[PDB]
Amino acid sequence: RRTPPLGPMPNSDIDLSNLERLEKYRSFDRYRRRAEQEAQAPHWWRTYREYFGEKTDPKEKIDIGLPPPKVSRTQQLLERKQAIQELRANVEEERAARLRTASVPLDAVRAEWERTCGPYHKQRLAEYYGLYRDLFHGATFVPRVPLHVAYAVGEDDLMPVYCGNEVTPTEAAQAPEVTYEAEEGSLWTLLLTSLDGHLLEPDAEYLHWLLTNIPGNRVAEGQVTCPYLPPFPARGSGIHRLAFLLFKQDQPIDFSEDARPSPCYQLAQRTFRTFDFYKKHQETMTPAGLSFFQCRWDDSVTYIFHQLLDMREPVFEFVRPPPYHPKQKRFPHRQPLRYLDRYRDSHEPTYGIY
Amino acid sequence: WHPGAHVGVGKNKCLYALEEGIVRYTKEVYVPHPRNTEAVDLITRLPKGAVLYKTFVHVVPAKPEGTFKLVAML
């Protein structure tokens, strides 16, 4: 029996009457490129992706945020062409390239990258790490405004902070220094949250560092509603990713549901939901900046558990499921003598009635 | 058939599950390893724009690796 094809089966467009005139896959590389082309493309038959892929909704992700400025593409290409023109006109770059002795300023490259198109890649990293699906339940934005943060180790050196970096609790024990390059005049709001820090329930987050009504870049003048407390990643719990969020407060807003007293070390107070928090407070403003990092258990975490938090410290552990074994049977056939050890409970012996 | 998604292959060309879960059959593209000379030269002789497919088995991992559980509250 046969059934006609549902959709257009592959290799049907090509013709067979003419075969020698056709051009071939002269290269495994070209064949591979075409293979990934057809893997990218969808198919009517059952495929690997429709089983093992995140199944993102077909609708675009809602993001009412800062649009790009109107950059004159004409003058942009003009100045870029001029730049490459004097670049190719230079004299030493020939020997540099043909002797393989050139380099490039990493810091400057990073600077103009995060200026031009960094935000798109940072949004990519955010939607990868899972900030959006957990924070906003799918919605996204673009961190147009750059953002730098640092934890001064003593005072000589400092630990930087960027998307997806390790941070020690000993270094995060104090408040960080922050810069976001905005003296315009419009207000700002900043908040450091822990996504997976909450332990009693999922879909819950803590808040360690809140500042609101920040006129300009200066941060000290920004009032605080939720005072500072470093994170407390438990031993064995794994890793906790901490998020810096920054919104462009267009006009001053009050904080009553949000007003919290002196730290008082209350997780019920530190916990809330960013979803409804944004839905309520942030209807006037929009996201402008975003960063994050990753943290783990430490001796300072133990110290703040025992002394600061005024509570015992938890101790978790990863546990694998039990190894599967099928039902026993009274008379196994061609199974080695350790079949009984596979099921015995006690390693030691026992005697029934003696 | 051919392996895929937590399915190894023995020397006798038998397929075996590496993880515990549900099995599924699909059809995907077949990119050989360069050492497979006959496969490579077949790919070369193949005409441009055309691509082959082959069956694949894929076990869907049912359960997670494990779970984090509390050991002591001290």
């Binding site: 029996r1 046969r2 094809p5 089966m9 090509i14 067979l16 038959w45 | 059809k27 077949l42 193949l46």
Partner: peptide, 19 residues
């Protein structure tokens, strides 16, 4: 499989030269 519409999806001998 034959009965199903996906039959003949993998064949290549008619693509390559026969000899």
């Amino acid at each position: 499989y034959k009965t199903k519409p996906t039959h003949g999806i993998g064949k290549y001998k008619h693509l390559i030269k026969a000899e």
